[PDB]
């Protein structure tokens, strides 16, 4: 008869949210200002702001019995379909910068992260803000999707659902796309640098998910209605957060926004010792006693930044250590999490530690401070004694995204919500273990004569034309068919961009127009690059393909790659299939290959167990295709066909992918890959593979060794930039322009399947791989560079990823150790820890000079010393030394000094010149040499640097060691520079 | 089959590979216990022609017998049940977190006296076992030896194994270069020696002792042959500044196992029974006649006096004896080798060319020029 205690307790909590929340909505528009101070509406903070309004409603409807509580019910949900349709009117009035954010994905083209809360229109301008926030599109995306799948109906035009399709696209080059984040000042130093946060990459794949196939119109929708979402992007963004996490970025060690990723809303994170080791990471370095910090070295609202400012200088830096504005937004995150995961004891101690900064204002209820700030006068002592000196709340009070998630936990806490109901699409199961999945092949044979030649050798299957009416096409085909998905002509939207396909993509059965279509995978393809016409490259890329496949399909059904076996797979003969691939087919009846369950069979067979997926776009250029489609000598011609001229891709006829057909049949890889290089045949997933290695902690450099031309990539380029600047660092010469992106597929390739190789090696430098490839190229069949570089063109794919991965593994086929003392300076391989190491070493010391150029002991305060950027400035006085063997001379050099100073008590308190040690070192090895009967002839002096070759080739320890004498000189320069020193602990 | 493999086991993710054959940890469905799966490709990706097709599989359906034959002891892994199909031949086994004995070697460049005591003990040990069986390895290189968290010794890849029929003698040539016996190159040499039976395993572990507590093989060199005539002749020393501070309790274990003749050679029964191998029982009367007595209480006294006398004499770090000879000395040169594999331990690797001595120069350059 009277309402239950469940719905009286929730007016208090509605008063909470009604004082402190919907009073603030906008009339006209449903946004909330952040504050009195800042009236305008941020995307990110107002989905985050109507999360306890839709809490709270749907705590109300689960009683709506009564006239009054199913309208105050509908108020919560119709006002949270306010925010997200007043949100959408404003991303939708920059349908311009959406569209072309899609191609180009600039900072200059994004959604402003701000709108008038007033009008939705756009506040500032496209460069007056830091607008690139990839995570706060995608956290309307998620809760687009999740407060539709809860019933909200926030869509209501199929306009719309081309709208958010084409925002799909929006953010799915998050994994690929540097973005200011959650915090819009991009990396740490607040100098306008976007960078690769995981928070924009994991809250990208949280809403691609989450809008995986969700019918945005509810349940009473259709498949036009449907948002389609393609799991090589989803997945993508996995590979970034696996390689990013426990980091934030490459610039933060970690972020306590990644609680936003790790848990909530996003559980973008699979393994669960990922998701515990970042929670713990921010315990430790983040957490205090009043909040948790941003991110190391904030200083958003420390009192030793100047509020006029908008950027930091970089020496500003290292006066926000240890003072830094801890915002109890985070102590929320911990609770969502414990409610999540299920730890009462987490929802316990975050709860008392949250309501003891709480700060009470109006009637008693509670508000969430922004940030507590060190007060000015006690800022000395909290940099001596940390996270125990008064803080101050200042910032926004209350903090509106802050102050929804504590009324969203303690709503769930207190029993009115369930994890479930506030995500409905199960994000939470997210860490429960995937089992891999059986991957079916169905090998194919592109004419009938192969099928002879794999029957002759028992191997069972289809032609191409017995699969009919399944009917199979190329990746690239799959590609455009997407690019008719989102199109709306009078909205501008013009669908997917062509994307690269991966297996994930291609290994679904596609029903468009009622005609199942299979599509081979992308590795296969022979017109885009030479990396499909080395037969014994397919097995390697099908290998890690199908490894790629198991552990990585969340998709109903099993995936079906289907496999056409060409004639370039076949042997030279024409009569025998090549034996590499050979080996690979009978792998894959057996049941497993490259660690992958293999059900080898039939396509037919496989129509029933697959991932049927119906492209309904395709429903009634592409659509054309598809409409028919349904119903003397080679060498001498390229110097013929480069002095034609530069290539006029006119018709200047008396086509060269006609001479690269025959040159595909005769293998010959010098000759194909110029013609790729003079034709500018260029691979599809560099940008992948660059962002890869990048997502390592990696800088990669591309081009020859001086720095003007050869150019550094530290934040992930789009397509068309990246291969502009290999391009242009190509400095014209087309053999190193493929050879630079054909190695970088390598690398990525390797660092995927074994990070161990570049543990030691910090900034992955293309450009000299392939000058450090030729050397050993060029002792191996002695023969001169200009040989080598012609042979370096020439050797196969697999053996050119084979010898890259004999360089980097440390495998051998001058002298022995000046032959890996070329292969370890010259790749700027260093110790684990030695970047580390220099930091502890420098605080004893004044600098580290090389040939005369210092680094100074004011690098140590700078950056961390886990900092990359310090890492640049160690490897950059590195390199002051031309030769790559002395440079190695150098960096056992520095050690010896840190195994020194270890000993040594008293600090040297001046400059060190890390070359002068190498000098007298060269000068002693000299002289026991010639005590112990060493002639004139070998010990020969190096011609530039000025050590004895013998010197180079000496081993590291041993009594008459490089190191030995490194660690004898390293003692009688501290003897001038040191008068007296105190050596202890041995 | 290949359903009767994932029944029961799923290969999680990689942990090592090889020549052809890739080890693999996995899950065991019905325990949920950590297993260790080697997979070897049997065609090898083309490369093996029929023959050595058939040849691995002989010698990997061999290589189940050796590993069935010997079981439920310590410090061997147990060979918990083989799968093989036409292209692929599955081992599961005990997982083994931590990696061989030439990754822990390359970590620690010279193992301590207590460390190697037991890990050998176990060799030893092993080594017993497999003797009592009649079972030579041919194969006791430390990459053929795994270690677990414990830093418990698994003796992995008998490959090359084969059970001698009861007094016959063996004459194929089994073994990368380095660990082999003097009769092995010999009997390659020559056809009068009649062959080599189970004392072949002694001096392959005296080798370890060598490279365990020193960092580097016994007899090296970078050319193939020349460190044969090292190893038939058997020149070895126990050379300075590096194998001086040892206890001489260690040197003549080295030398019986390092003895160019096999029947002088140190079985691995007695092997056990030389001093250092001796443990401490509590309980334990040991009678003694007066002088017995007597020198026990001098003997103890002598100690005491020892110990003081051994640790008066250490010198100091100073600067000076840095200038004149690091190495000379204990704590500086065992961190010189220390970091010398930290920077070029990825330049060690199983073979000749990559062995660890490559990172030591003892000698000269004058008399390694010599010839
Ligand atoms: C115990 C060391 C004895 C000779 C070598 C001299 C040591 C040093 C000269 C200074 C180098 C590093 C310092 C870190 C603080």
Redesign the pocket.
Known sequence: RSRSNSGVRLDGYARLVQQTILCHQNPVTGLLPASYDQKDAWVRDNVYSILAVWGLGLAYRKNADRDEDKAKAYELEQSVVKLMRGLLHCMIRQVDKVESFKYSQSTKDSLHAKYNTKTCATVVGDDQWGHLQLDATSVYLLFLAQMTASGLHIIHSLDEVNFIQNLVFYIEAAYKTADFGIWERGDKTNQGISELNASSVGMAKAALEALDELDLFGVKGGPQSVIHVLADEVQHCQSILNSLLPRASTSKEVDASLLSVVSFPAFAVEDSQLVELTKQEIITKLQGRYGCCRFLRDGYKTPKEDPNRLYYEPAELKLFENIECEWPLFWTYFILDGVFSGNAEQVQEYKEALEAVLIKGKNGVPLLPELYSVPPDRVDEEYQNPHTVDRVPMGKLPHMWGQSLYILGSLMAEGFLAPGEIDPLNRRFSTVPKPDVVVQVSILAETEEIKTILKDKGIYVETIAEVYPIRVQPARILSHIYSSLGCNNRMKLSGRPYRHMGVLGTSKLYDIRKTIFTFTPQFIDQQQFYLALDNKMIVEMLRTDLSYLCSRWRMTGQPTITFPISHSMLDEDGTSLNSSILAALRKMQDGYFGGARVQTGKLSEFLTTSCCTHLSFMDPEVARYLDHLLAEQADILYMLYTMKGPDWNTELYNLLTELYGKVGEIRHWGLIRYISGILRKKVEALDEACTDLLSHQKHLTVGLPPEPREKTISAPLPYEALTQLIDEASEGDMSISILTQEIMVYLAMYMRTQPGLFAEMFRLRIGLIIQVMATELAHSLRCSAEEATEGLMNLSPSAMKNLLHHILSGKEFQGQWQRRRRLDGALNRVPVGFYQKVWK?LQ??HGLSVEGFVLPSSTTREMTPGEIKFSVHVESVLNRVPQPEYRQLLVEAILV?TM??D??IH??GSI?AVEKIVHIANDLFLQEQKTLGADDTMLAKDPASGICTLLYDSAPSGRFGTMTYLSKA??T??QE??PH?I?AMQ | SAQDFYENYEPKEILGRGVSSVVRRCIHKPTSQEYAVKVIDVTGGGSFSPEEVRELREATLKEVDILRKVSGHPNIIQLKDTYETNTFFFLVFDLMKRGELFDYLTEKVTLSEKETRKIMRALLEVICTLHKLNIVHRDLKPENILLDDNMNIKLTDFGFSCQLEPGERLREVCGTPSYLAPEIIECSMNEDHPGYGKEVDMWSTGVIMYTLLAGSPPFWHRKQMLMLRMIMSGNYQFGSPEWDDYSDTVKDLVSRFLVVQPQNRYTAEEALAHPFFQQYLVEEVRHFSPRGKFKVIALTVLASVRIYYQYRRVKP?T?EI?IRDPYALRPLRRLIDAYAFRIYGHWVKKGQQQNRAALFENTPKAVLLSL
């Open positions: 070493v004893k010391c000094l020194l100073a000993i040594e600090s040297i060190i390293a003692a320069y501290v520079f040191l020193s050596c | 770090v600067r840095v």
